[PDB]
Design a protein around this ligand. Structure first.
Ligand SMILES: CCCCCCCCO[C@@H]1O[C@H](CO)[C@@H](O)[C@H](O)[C@H]1O
Ligand SMILES: CCCCCCCCO[C@@H]1O[C@H](CO)[C@@H](O)[C@H](O)[C@H]1O
Ligand SMILES: CN(C)C[C@@H](c1ccc(O)cc1)C1(O)CCCCC1
Ligand SMILES: CN(C)C[C@@H](c1ccc(O)cc1)C1(O)CCCCC1
Ligand code: NA
Ligand code: NA
Length: 504
């Protein structure tokens, strides 16, 4: 079996998986809307009671499976619980990251496209008033994506956007086809320092921003001034638990697959804790110092609330580029921003396609070349739905990227810590550990952590599902039909895998 060459490479590859666009775009928006500085209270608590425990568990499940030559949940769940229902549940740990990758690589291609356009100066150049500056950039993004101008739910991506997507798929393949150590690990050792350097430069350059409407200090002020009155709202606590779960990328099955390349008696306790801490530092220190302070420095603290409510996608692809065009060398500054987002996305997408690759290698005995190429073919083909059907991305992101991940994360807990055995699971986590997991975490993993996820799943299901099922355009069924078919296809592959094993 393939293995990570160094401990540093493993940690950077794991942190690289976690650190993405959400760190620099989603977190700052969530924090500003939920108490600002006071949001750090439930954020840390969620990190201690949910994020950290579940991550140790996914590392453990991965390493345990890897020792027996299996990197994906259909096989791994069966090893933890020899039941037919376990293999089926395990399909979700293959289905979720595949479906997400189908839309994420496209989003990733946007950042490369924008990076190129900004580097060469092929960007709008306004003109005054905020709407007069934002609108040319709004249209810039809309023309790139091909946002519907009529009543049809049809996207029409520019030829440039399509070609960049092809290039982006090529780059993902180039890294993945070289394997774990010479590909993913090797890239992580280059991408993470580059990511850190670009982020620091952007933080510094943002801090120097001075406009008649305000400064960057006003931005850090608005964002970090505690509003403890919001701590009463359970939605804030739900948002904190949600943000922690999303940022660490739990319940995607990607962590499990990566951990399956960790040697049997190699540490996962400290390595896991370190990777998680890196994502958090990158999230609160770097992510919280760029987008929001810049938006406040330029538009004034008077528009800070409106900016936060506008969303993370508006902030990263419209608002920030618009502000850049109004600063000295902002064209190059825009390049660095999207270059940053691209590498952050690329380190995440190579991780997200690895489970499907690992399934074909471990269970269907495909060579790495064939496994990578076929995985890329599935992703590339399926991505045309996201590229041409409006809101297809939103539907996939809800079922797989939102509801699915919390459900699967809870499924991981129950199978590992309740079915497989809490004592066996506890030993499996701490085995080979440089440091040992504090004894208190045994009860957290067994009672507290699943309780939090259960609440999160129930609340979101009652809140969002009726809306999605009743107030959406009929075209969502196109996306639903296709991704359900993808599940059936993966279920069939699991069936072929067990029939091949019975023969050999
Ligand atoms: C779900 C993926 C399907 C999207 C494929 C859309 C391809 C768009 O192709 C369309 O072909 C037509 C000719 O038949 C042309 O008239 C249109 O201009 C062209 O855009
Ligand atoms: C998810 C599906 C995305 C829809 C793809 C949009 C393509 C719309 O394109 C349509 O293609 C038809 C070709 O059969 C032509 O008859 C129409 O003239 C053309 O507008
Ligand atoms: C779970 N949600 C809702 C967040 C995702 C998203 C997807 C679609 C969308 O319209 C907004 C956010 C997101 O993860 C996709 C791009 C990276 C930042 C946000
Ligand atoms: C840890 N994060 C945030 C990255 C993940 C992700 C998940 C959802 C999403 O909307 C964006 C990225 C991702 O790595 C999951 C597997 C498929 C590629 C993206
Ligand atoms: Na993250
Ligand atoms: Na990443």
């Amino acid at each position: 079996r393939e293995h990570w060459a160094t401990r540093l490479g493993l940690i950077l590859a794991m942190a690289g998986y976690a650190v993405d666009l959400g760190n620099f775009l989603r977190f700052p928006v969530q924090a500003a809307e939920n108490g600002g500085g006071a949001f750090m209270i439930p954020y840390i608590i969620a990190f201690l009671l949910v994020g950290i425990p579940l991550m140790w568990i996914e590392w453990a499940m991965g390493r345990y499976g890897g020792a027996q030559g299996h990197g994906t949940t259909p096989a791994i769940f069966y090893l933890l619980w020899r039941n037919r229902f376990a293999k089926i549940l395990g399909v979700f740990g293959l289905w979720i990251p595949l479906v997400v990758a189908i839309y994420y690589v496209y989003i990733e291609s946007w950042t490369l496209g924008f990076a190129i356009k900004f580097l060469v100066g092929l960007v709008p150049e306004p003109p005054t008033d905020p709407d007069s500056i934002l609108r040319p950039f709004k249209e810039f993004l809309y023309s790139y994506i091909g946002v519907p101008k009529g009543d049809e739910p049809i996207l029409k991506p520019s030829l440039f956007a399509y070609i960049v997507f092809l290039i982006t798929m090529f780059i993902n393949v180039s890294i993945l086809i070289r394997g774990i150590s010479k590909g993913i690990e090797r890239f992580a050792k280059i991408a993470m320092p580059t990511l850190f350097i670009l982020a620091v430069f952007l933080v510094i350059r943002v801090f120097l921003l001075e406009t008649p409407n305000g400064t960057a200090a006003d931005g850090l002020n608005f964002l970090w001034t505690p509003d403890f009155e919001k701590l009463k709202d359970p939605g804030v606590w739900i948002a904190a638990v949600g943000q922690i779960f999303f940022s660490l990328g739990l319940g995607f099955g990607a962590i499990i697959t990566f951990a399956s390349y960790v040697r049997k008696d190699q540490d996962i306790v400290l390595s896991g804790l370190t990777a998680a801490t890196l994502n958090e530092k990158a999230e609160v220190i770097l992510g919280g110092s760029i987008s929001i302070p810049a938006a406040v420095a330029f538009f004034g603290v008077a528009n800070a609330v409106a900016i936060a409510k506008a969303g993370a996608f508006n902030l990263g692809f419209i608002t920030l580029p618009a502000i850049f065009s109004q600063t000295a060398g902002g064209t190059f500054l825009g390049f660095l921003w999207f270059f940053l987002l691209f590498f952050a996305g690329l380190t995440s997408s190579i991780a997200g396609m690895q489970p499907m690759i690992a399934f074909l290698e471990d269970e269907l005995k495909l060579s790495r070349k064939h496994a990578v190429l076929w995985t890329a073919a599935i992703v590339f083909f399926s991505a045309h739905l996201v590229m041409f059907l409006n809101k297809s991305l939103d539907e996939m992101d809800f079922w797989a990227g939102t509801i699915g991940v919390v459900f699967f994360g809870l499924t991981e807990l129950i199978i590992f810590f309740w079915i497989f055995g809490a004592d066996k699971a506890w030993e499996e986590i701490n085995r080979g550990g440089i440091i040992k997991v504090p004894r208190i975490y045994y009860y957290v993993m067994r009672y507290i952590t699943p309780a939090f996820l259960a609440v999160l799943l129930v609340v979101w299901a009652r809140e969002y599902i009726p809306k999605i099922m009743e107030e959406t355009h009929w075209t969502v069924w196109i996306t639903r039909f296709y991704i359900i078919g993808l599940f059936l296809f993966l279920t069939f592959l699991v069936f072929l895998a067990e029939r091949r094993r019975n023969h050999e």
